[PDB]
C-alpha cells in the first residue's frame, strides 16, 4: 500500500517494541497505513502525521519517518528513544510543522543545523531528555517557530540572546537546565507575542530586565527557583492579559508594587520565599484572583479589606511574615476559600465568622498569632475541613459541638489556648480523625467514651487540661493508637486490665494525675511500647515482672504508692531514678529485701 | 524542618512500606512535626523516630545524620537489610539506637563511639560481622547493650562502660573471645 506503508515498516524495524504497540503495522490483512495505530491521514490518503506517544519504544531516532513526503507532525512523546541527534537525522524533514521528542532518553547536543533543516517548524519540544552543551545561537534563524520547550535537560552555557530574534514565539520554556549564572537576556523583551515564559531553575541572577515590560501579551510568567534580585518591577501592572505570575524562591526585595490592585485578569500570584518588605498593596481589585501566596517574606502591616472583592479566591498563604491587625471580618463569606495558612504572623482579633461561607474550606491553619475570642457556630457546619491548626493563640470559650464531629477532619490541633468545656458526644462524627492535639487548655469533664469508636486515631495529646473521671475503657479498642498523652490532668480511678488492643501503642503518658489501682500486668506485653510515664499518681501494689519484657527508653513510675520487690532486671543501680518517691519499694538480694 | 524533612523523605523513598506507615510523610509540609511516627521538640526539630514493628524493608540512608537533635531512633522488628550507616555517629544527642530484629549486615561502625550521650544500644538479632569497636568503651553514658544473635568475632572489651555488661549482651555470636565469654582469646 504505497511507499508510506514501506517507510513506516522500515522505521518500526529500527526500534525495539517490547509491548507490541505497533502490532497493527507489521500484521497484514491488506490494511492501508491510514488505519494503523498512531498514523493519521488527510483526505487524499497521505500520511500527514505520526503520533507514537507512550508506546514504550526503545532505540535511536527513526530519521526514516521523514521520507514521508506529506509529514507535518511527528510525536515520539514519552518513549525510550535513545542515543543522540545528528544533522543527518533531519535532512529530509523540511515539511515538519510540529516536532515532539519530549520525555525520551536523548543525550548529546542539539544539532546546530536544525533551523536550516526545519524551516517550517511551529512547535519544537525536546523536554525531559538528557541533552547537554549549549542551546545553538542558530535558533535565532527560525522564521515561524511559535513554541520552544527544552525544559528538563542538562543544557549548559547561557540562554542565547538570539532567541529574541524569533518574534513568532508565543511560548518559551527553558526551565530546569544546567545553565551558568547569568542575567535574563535583555533581547527576550523583543518577543512581543510571548504568552508563556518559563525560566524556572535556570540559575538566573540580577534584576528582571526592563526590556520585559514590552511582553504585554504574557499569560504565564514563571521565574521560580533562581537568584533574581531587586524589586518586583511595577510594570507587571501593564501586563494587560496576565493570569499567572510565579516568582517564588528568589532574592527579590523591596515592596510589592502598589499598582498591583488593578490587575483584573490575575488568577495566580506567588512571590513566596523571597526577601519582600513593606505592606501588602491596598485598594485591591483582583476580580479573578484564585491564589495569593506571599509566605516566608518579611511583609508587615495588615491584610486589606479589599481582598474580599476577590470572589473566586481559593488559596491564601501568607505564613511566616510580620503581618499585624485584624483579618477582614467578611473573609470567606463570598469566596470559595479552600486553603488558608496565615501561621507565624502577629494577627489579632476574631477569626472571621463566615470564613467557610461557601463550604469549601479544607485547610484552616493559623498557628502562632494572637487570635482571640471564640470559634463561631458556623465553622461547625464546615464539613469540607480536613486540617485545622489553631495552636498557640489567645482563643477561648467553648468549642461548638458540631466542630468536634466534622466528617473529614483529620488533624485537629487546638493546643495552647484557653478553651473551656467538655469534649461532647458528637465527636462520633469525626470518622477520619487521626491526630487530636488539645494540650495546654482548660478542657474539663470526662474524656467521652465516643473517642474509642474512632478506629483510625493514631495520636491523642491532651496534657495540661482539667480532664476528670476515668480513662474510657473504649480507648483500648483503638488498634492504631501510637501516642496517648493525658498527663497533667485531674483523671482518677484505674487503667483497664485488658490492653492487648493497644498493639501499636508506642508512648503512654499518664503522669501527674490522680490515678489509682495496680499497674496492669498486660502493660508488659504491648509489642511496641517504648515510653511509659505513670509518675506522680497514686498507683499501688507490685511493679509487674512483665515490665521486664519491655525494651523501654523512658520508664518513670516515680511518686506513686508502689511497694514490694523491684523486678530483678530493674533493681540495677542504673534504673534507680525510675522509682524515686515510692517508700515501700525494696531491692531483694535473695532473702533480704531493703528499701532503696 | 526543611533539611530534616528532606532527610526523612529520602529515607521513605529508599524503604519499602507495604502497610503505608509512612503515608503521612508529606514533603510539602514545612516541617515533619505533624507526621506520624516522628516527634519534635518545642523548636520543631526531630527528637524521635518511632518505626518499630512496621513491616519495613530496604535499607537506611546516610542522610539520617542531619537529624542533630534526634534522641531516640527505633527501627526494630522490621526486615531492613544493608549496612548500619557510618554517619549515624553524627547524631550527637542520640540516647537510644534500637536496630534490633532486622537483617543488618556488615560491621558495627567505628563512628558509633562518637555518640557521647548514648545510653541504650540494642543491635541484637541481625547479621552483623567483624569486631566490636573499642571506641564504644569511651561512651560514659552507655548502660544497656545487646549485640547478641549476630555474627560478631574477635575480642570483647571489658573496660570503661563495658565493665557493666554480662555474657547475655554478647551471646550466640560467631567467634567472640575474652573474659566475659568462656573462651580466652586466640
Amino acid at each position: 500500500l504505497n511507499q508510506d506503508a514501506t517507510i513506516l515498516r522500515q522505521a518500526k524495524l529500527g526500534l525495539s517494541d517490547p509491548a507490541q504497540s505497533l502490532s497493527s503495522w507489521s500484521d497484514n490483512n491488506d490494511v492501508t497505513p491510514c488505519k494503523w495505530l498512531g498514523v493519521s491521514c488527510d483526505a487524499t490518503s497521505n500520511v500527514v502525521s505520526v503520533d507514537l506517544s507512550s508506546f514504550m519504544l526503545v532505540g535511536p531516532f527513526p530519521s526514516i519517518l521523514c521520507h514521508l513526503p506529506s509529514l507535518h507532525s511527528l510525536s515520539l512523546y514519552n518513549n525510550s528513544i535513545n542515543g543522540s541527534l545528528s544533522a543527518d537525522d533531519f535532512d529530509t524533514c523540511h515539511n515538519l510543522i510540529s516536532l515532539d521528542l519530549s520525555e525520551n532518553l536523548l543525550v548529546g547536543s542539539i544539532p546546530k543545523s536544525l533551523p536550516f533543516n526545519l524551516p517550517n517548524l511551529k512547535f519544537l519540544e525536546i523536554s525531559g531528555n538528557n541533552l547537554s552543551d549549549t542551546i545553538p545561537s542558530s535558533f535565532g534563524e527560525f522564521r515561524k517557530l511559535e513554541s520552544l520547550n527544552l525544559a528538563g535537560n542538562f543544557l549548559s552555557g547561557t540562554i542565547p540572546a538570539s532567541l529574541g530574534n524569533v518574534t513568532t514565539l508565543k511560548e518559551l520554556k527553558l526551565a530546569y537546565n544546567l545553565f551558568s549564572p547569568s542575567q535574563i537576556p535583555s533581547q527576550l523583551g523583543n518577543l512581543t507575542e510571548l504568552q508563556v515564559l518559563w525560566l524556572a531553575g535556570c540559575n538566573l541572577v540580577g534584576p528582571i530586565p526592563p526590556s520585559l515590560s514590552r511582553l504585554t501579551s504574557l499569560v504565564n510568567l514563571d521565574l521560580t527557583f533562581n537568584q533574581l534580585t531587586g524589586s518586583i518591577p511595577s510594570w507587571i501592572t501593564q501586563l494587560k492579559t496576565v493570569e499567572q505570575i510565579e516568582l517564588f524562591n528568589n532574592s527579590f526585595s523591596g515592596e510589592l508594587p502598589e499598582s498591583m490592585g488593578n490587575m483584573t485578569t490575575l488568577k495566580r500570584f506567588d512571590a513566596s520565599m523571597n526577601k519582600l518588605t513593606g505592606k501588602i498593596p491596598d485598594n485591591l481589585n483582583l476580580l479573578n484572583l484564585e491564589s495569593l501566596n506571599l509566605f516566608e517574606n518579611m511583609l508587615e502591616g495588615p491584610l486589606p479589606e479589599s481582598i474580599t472583592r476577590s470572589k473566586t479566591l481559593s488559596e491564601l498563604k501568607l505564613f511566616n511574615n510580620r503581618l499585624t491587625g485584624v483579618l477582614p471580618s467578611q473573609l470567606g463569606a463570598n469566596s470559595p476559600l479552600q486553603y488558608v495558612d496565615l501561621s507565624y504572623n502577629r494577627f489579632s482579633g476574631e477569626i472571621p465568622a463566615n470564613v467557610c461561607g461557601e463550604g469549601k474550606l479544607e485547610y484552616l491553619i493559623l498557628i502562632d498569632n494572637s487570635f482571640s475570642g471564640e470559634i463561631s457556630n458556623n465553622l461547625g457546619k464546615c464539613k469540607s475541613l480536613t486540617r485545622v491548626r489553631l495552636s498557640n493563640n489567645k482563643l477561648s470559650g467553648q468549642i461548638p459541638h458540631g466542630f468536634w464531629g466534622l466528617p473529614r477532619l483529620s488533624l485537629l490541633e487546638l493546643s495552647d489556648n484557653s478553651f473551656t468545656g467538655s469534649i461532647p458526644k458528637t465527636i462520633i462524627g469525626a470518622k477520619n480523625l487521626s491526630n487530636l492535639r488539645i494540650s495546654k487548655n482548660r478542657f474539663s469533664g470526662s474524656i467521652p467514651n465516643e473517642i474509642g469508636s474512632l478506629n483510625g486515631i493514631i495520636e491523642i495529646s491532651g496534657a495540661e487540661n482539667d480532664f476528670s473521671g476515668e480513662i474510657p475503657e473504649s480507648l483500648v479498642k483503638l488498634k492504631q493508637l501510637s501516642r496517648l498523652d493525658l498527663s497533667k490532668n485531674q483523671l482518677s480511678g484505674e487503667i483497664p486490665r485488658e490492653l492487648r488492643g493497644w498493639k501499636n501503642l508506642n508512648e503512654l503518658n499518664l503522669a501527674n494525675n490522680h490515678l489509682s489501682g495496680e499497674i496492669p500486668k498486660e502493660v508488659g506485653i504491648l509489642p511496641v511500647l517504648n515510653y511509659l510515664d505513670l509518675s506522680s499518681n497514686q498507683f499501688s501494689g507490685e511493679i509487674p515482672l512483665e515490665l521486664q519484657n519491655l525494651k523501654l527508653n523512658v520508664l518513670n513510675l516515680s511518686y506513686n504508692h508502689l511497694s514490694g520487690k523491684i523486678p530483678p532486671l530493674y533493681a540495677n543501680k542504673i534504673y534507680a531514678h525510675d522509682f524515686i518517691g515510692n517508700p515501700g519499694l525494696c531491692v531483694d538480694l535473695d532473702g533480704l529485701c531493703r528499701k532503696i | 524542618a526543611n533539611l530534616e524533612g528532606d532527610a526523612l523523605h529520602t529515607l521513605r523513598v529508599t524503604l519499602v512500606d507495604p502497610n503505608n506507615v509512612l503515608q503521612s510523610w508529606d514533603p510539602t509540609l514545612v516541617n515533619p512535626c505533624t507526621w506520624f511516627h516522628v516527634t519534635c521538640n518545642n523548636e520543631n526539630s526531630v527528637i524521635r523516630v518511632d518505626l518499630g514493628n512496621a513491616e519495613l524493608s530496604g535499607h537506611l540512608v546516610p542522610e539520617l545524620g542531619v537529624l542533630k537533635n534526634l534522641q531516640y531512633l527505633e527501627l526494630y522488628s522490621n526486615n531492613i537489610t544493608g549496612p548500619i550507616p557510618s554517619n549515624l555517629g553524627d547524631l550527637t544527642n542520640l540516647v537510644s539506637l534500637d536496630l534490633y530484629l532486622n537483617s543488618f549486615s556488615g560491621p558495627i561502625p567505628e563512628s558509633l563511639g562518637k555518640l557521647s550521650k548514648l545510653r541504650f544500644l540494642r543491635l541484637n538479632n541481625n547479621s552483623l560481622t567483624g569486631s566490636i569497636p573499642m571506641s564504644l568503651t569511651q561512651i560514659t553514658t552507655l548502660q544497656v547493650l545487646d549485640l547478641s544473635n549476630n555474627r560478631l568475632s574477635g575480642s570483647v572489651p571489658d573496660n570503661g562502660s563495658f565493665s557493666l555488661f554480662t555474657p547475655i549482651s554478647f551471646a550466640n555470636n560467631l567467634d567472640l573471645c575474652g573474659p566475659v565469654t568462656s573462651h580466652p582469646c586466640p
Partner: peptide, 14 residues
C-alpha cells in the same frame, strides 16, 4: 520519564 515540576503555585503549608 523525567518529572518536571509544574508551572504552578508552591504547595508548601503550615
Amino acid at each position: 520519564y523525567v518529572p518536571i515540576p509544574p508551572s504552578a503555585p508552591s504547595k508548601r503549608h503550615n
